[PDB]
Amino acid sequence: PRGSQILCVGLVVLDVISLVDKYPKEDSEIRCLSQRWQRGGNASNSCTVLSLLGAPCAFMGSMAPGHVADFLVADFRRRGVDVSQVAWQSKGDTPSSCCIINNSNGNRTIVLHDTSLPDVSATDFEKVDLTQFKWIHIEGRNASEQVKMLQRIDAHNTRQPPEQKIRVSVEVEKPREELFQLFGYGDVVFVSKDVAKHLGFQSAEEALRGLYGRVRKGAVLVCAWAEEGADALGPDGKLLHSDAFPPPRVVDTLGAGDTFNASVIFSLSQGRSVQEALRFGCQVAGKKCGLQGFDGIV
Amino acid sequence: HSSGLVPRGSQILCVGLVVLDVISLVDKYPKEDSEIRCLSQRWQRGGNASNSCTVLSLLGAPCAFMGSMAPGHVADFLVADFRRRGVDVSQVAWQSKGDTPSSCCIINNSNGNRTIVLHDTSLPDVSATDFEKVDLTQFKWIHIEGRNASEQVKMLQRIDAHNTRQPPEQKIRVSVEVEKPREELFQLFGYGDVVFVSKDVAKHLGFQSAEEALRGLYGRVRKGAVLVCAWAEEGADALGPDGKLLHSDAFPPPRVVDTLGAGDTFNASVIFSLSQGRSVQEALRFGCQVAGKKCGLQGFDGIV
Numbered sequence: 001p002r003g004s005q006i007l008c009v010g011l012v013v014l015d016v017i018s019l020v021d022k023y024p025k026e027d028s029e030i031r032c033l034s035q036r037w038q039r040g041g042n043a044s045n046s047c048t049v050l051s052l053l054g055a056p057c058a059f060m061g062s063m064a065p066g067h068v069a070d071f072l073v074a075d076f077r078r079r080g081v082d083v084s085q086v087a088w089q090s091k092g093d094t095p096s097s098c099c100i101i102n103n104s105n106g107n108r109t110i111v112l113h114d115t116s117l118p119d120v121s122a123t124d125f126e127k128v129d130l131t132q133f134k135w136i137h138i139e140g141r142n143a144s145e146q147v148k149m150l151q152r153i154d155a156h157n158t159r160q161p162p163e164q165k166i167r168v169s170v171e172v173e174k175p176r177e178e179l180f181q182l183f184g185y186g187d188v189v190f191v192s193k194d195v196a197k198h199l200g201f202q203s204a205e206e207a208l209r210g211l212y213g214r215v216r217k218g219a220v221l222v223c224a225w226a227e228e229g230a231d232a233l234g235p236d237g238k239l240l241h242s243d244a245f246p247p248p249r250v251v252d253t254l255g256a257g258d259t260f261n262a263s264v265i266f267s268l269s270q271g272r273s274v275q276e277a278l279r280f281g282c283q284v285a286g287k288k289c290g291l292q293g294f295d296g297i298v
Numbered sequence: 299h300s301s302g303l304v305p306r307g308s309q310i311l312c313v314g315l316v317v318l319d320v321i322s323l324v325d326k327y328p329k330e331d332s333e334i335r336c337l338s339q340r341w342q343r344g345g346n347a348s349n350s351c352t353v354l355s356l357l358g359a360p361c362a363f364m365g366s367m368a369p370g371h372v373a374d375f376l377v378a379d380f381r382r383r384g385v386d387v388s389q390v391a392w393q394s395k396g397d398t399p400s401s402c403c404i405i406n407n408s409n410g411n412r413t414i415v416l417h418d419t420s421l422p423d424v425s426a427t428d429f430e431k432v433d434l435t436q437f438k439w440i441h442i443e444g445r446n447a448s449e450q451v452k453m454l455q456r457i458d459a460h461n462t463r464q465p466p467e468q469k470i471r472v473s474v475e476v477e478k479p480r481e482e483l484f485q486l487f488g489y490g491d492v493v494f495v496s497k498d499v500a501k502h503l504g505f506q507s508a509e510e511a512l513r514g515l516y517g518r519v520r521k522g523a524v525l526v527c528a529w530a531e532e533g534a535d536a537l538g539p540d541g542k543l544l545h546s547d548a549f550p551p552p553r554v555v556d557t558l559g560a561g562d563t564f565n566a567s568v569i570f571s572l573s574q575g576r577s578v579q580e581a582l583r584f585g586c587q588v589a590g591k592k593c594g595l596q597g598f599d600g601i602v
């Protein structure tokens with residue numbers, strides 16, 4: 001535990017999954033093919049992927065003590081994911097969602113139950129021993145609070161040898177304008193196709209060109225575009241692309257996004273080029289889209 | 299482990315489905331492949347037999363549920379919910395294959411429409427051989443929700459065999475519900491002292507009222523039986539061997555809040571009333587009152 005772990009900060013959510021033949025028409029009744037529970041949320045799913053990739057990692061997000069959280073915790077621990085930094089709440093419930101996964105094309109429809117659960121705070125983050133970590137990934141959410149956490153990492157970085165920087169990634173996944181300030185932080189910034197489209201952009205290339213001016217100097221902006229693979233753009237101005245690796249049957253895309261991000265991070269943290277990390281990201285996400293859940297992606 | 303002494307001839311048993319219903323209230327029905335925020339979510343123990351055991355316990359009857367569950371967090375939730383309602387779950391038939399049934403119910407806040415993703419069918423139903431191993435003496439009434447009928451026929455014959463050996467006051471009374479319009483369930487009409495048939499089933503057989511359903515289906519019940527058909531806001535009818543069609547109007551509450559489980563409230567309250575020794579006409583009326591009270595309340599709290 002000396003700059004050896006990856007940390008992801010974001011949501012952990014109980015995903016109550018129904019696998020169906022066809023997405024139900026409104027006001028109809030359909031019998032699902034199979035049912036399961038999955039530990040979800042973005043940062044949490046990334047830890048699943050990191051752990052399967054063999055990277056020691058740690059999750060940090062809010063949970064309320066409970067049966068739900070007990071299942072989540074057992075799950076994390078079964079994966080060897082570090083929960084030591086979890087910010088336990090005494091107020092609110094563990095969030096949960098119903099996910100209907102369409103077995104015929106892998107589409108996933110998520111009915112999210114937002115609880116009270118208050119977010120991980122600057123002050124929570126204050127308590128964290130940054131020295132454990134080589135890489136810290138932040139799922140954009142409570143921006144102002146996270147901006148301070150990023151400020152904290154910058155701080156700790158300035159006072160360390162180049163050999164001992166903590167690399168930082170950020171994801172701006174959700175269309176809300178609160179998050180747009182997050183583009184300014186981190187060595188790697190992941191911007192979702194949803195965010196990109198919601199800002200008027202029609203492809204990864206366009207989005208990268210359109211938004212690069214918002215990242216910080218030296219940063220790599222990354223934009224995955226579902227079956228069209230993923231693109232990246234660094235300080236050299238050269239657009240990089242990877243085709244997708246679609247499985248012959250796409251059966252489950254829940255967590256595809258997070259699988260790509262974790263795989264990109266893992267690859268970069270292993271010292272691979274951005275081009276190689278973009279391909280690996282698309283490769284692992286493609287493998288994942290052909291399987292239910294996350295086992296067997298490697 | 300463990301379980302205390304249940305006095306002989308004391309409990310009412312309901313056999314059938316328990317399911318975890320996840321109910322989400324939404325602004326708009328979600329487009330496929332989107333992520334939406336529901337207005338509210340709740341996890342509720344559901345199922346016809348399961349709902350009836352809740353009502354029985356609230357009415358003051360010792361009651362027991364028998365159905366299938368598999369070990370896991372779903373069953374833990376359901377078992378804790380049964381116990382919170384005072385239901386005896388010692389006869390649960392624990393299974394090694396399949397999932398405890400779980401359903402996803404999306405309610406449009408606009409128009410009240412229910413889209414339902416129903417549980418899978420991986421968990422095996424209680425079988426006749428599971429039933430053979432149950433000591434029946436602690437039960438005074440056994441109610442069977444019609445599901446896997448050809449196995450449930452043998453359970454029913456096992457109860458008949460028990461009853462032929464008992465003195466009249468240790469006979470176990472039996473009821474059956476046929477609530478789903480499935481052909482295999484039709485043979486259950488011929489068993490039980492009390493047979494409940496649903497409006498949806500009556501309508502699927504082409505009957506347009508409770509009167510028409512009872513007169514048209516009474517031929518199918520065993521000699522001496524009472525056939526019972528509730529018809530929502532039009533109240534309910536019963537018909538027994540004397541040929542007299544009995545009726546009670548509904549008792550609609552001031553404002554209708556929640557009709558889910560109304561038909562299970564009615565069922566359980568008719569059984570309870572009959573098991574207390576009341577006449578059919580009294581049970582029919584008591585069933586309509588409790589059910590109509592229920593429809594004015596969220597869930598089952600406050601039904602008596």
Ligand SMILES: C[C@H]1CCN1c1nc(-c2cnn(CC(=O)N3CCNCC3)c2)cc(C(F)(F)F)n1
Nearest residue numbers: 224226227229244245246253256257260285286
């Ligand atoms: C991660 C990317 C980089 C290569 N990855 C990849 N993604 C997907 C995929 C399918 N659906 N989604 C999610 C999505 O589009 N939406 C969800 C949110 N709402 C808007 C629509 C991602 C499929 C494949 C594959 F090609 F393999 F099939 N590969």
